[PDB]
Amino acid sequence: PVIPLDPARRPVIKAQVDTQTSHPKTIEALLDTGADMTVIPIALFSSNTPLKNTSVLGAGGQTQDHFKLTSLPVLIRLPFRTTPIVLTSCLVDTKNNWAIIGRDALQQCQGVLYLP
Amino acid sequence: PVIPLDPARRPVIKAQVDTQTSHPKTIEALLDTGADMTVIPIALFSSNTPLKNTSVLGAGGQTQDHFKLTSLPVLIRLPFRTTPIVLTSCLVDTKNNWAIIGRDALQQCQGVLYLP
């Protein structure tokens, strides 16, 4: 689909995310061409998942605390597709503020930006 | 122009920014569907322009200090376009780190995302 861009309405989609640590779950994710990597909430993961420490650069500078990296790939299915996006690793928001489909995932579903 | 999305290559554009406090300058800016509003480096504004306190939420959480809000509109012209984007307000990076074209600007471009 074609998603218009509007400051007042964030471009979000429903996605089914399988972390391979518990059953696949539905999230609402922000479509973000400014994210190098996809971010999913830590709430998706079972209690004893090994997640790696990582740094992430965002608006207010570098954060060491907020994000971990998955050890296993994450599979993501978008509304009308059976074929999953498979990301070798993705960021995990330890604060559960963010679900963001970034350019890693958008690349796999051949998503583009179009400016007339 | 179609802009393919690739985690390894940030989607950037050259944009001429007119803060109306100084001579316009052309900068390289990130095309960012996950940005509510556009961000301009504080280095593009004259020393001692009035700038408003503001809070911004990003990957490291909320910052009170890092960004100001402009007092005057900011006009932005893209390659090969005469008509400016006119932003009532936008964010100002006091750390000179970021130039980000957000959905406020993208809406005026009539830019869209396309997921096949």
Binding site: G34, L57 | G34, L57, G102
Partner: peptide
């Protein structure tokens, strides 16, 4: 680091 981008 990966970059991830801005909300008000």
């Amino acid at each position: 680091a990966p970059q991830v981008x801005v909300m008000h």
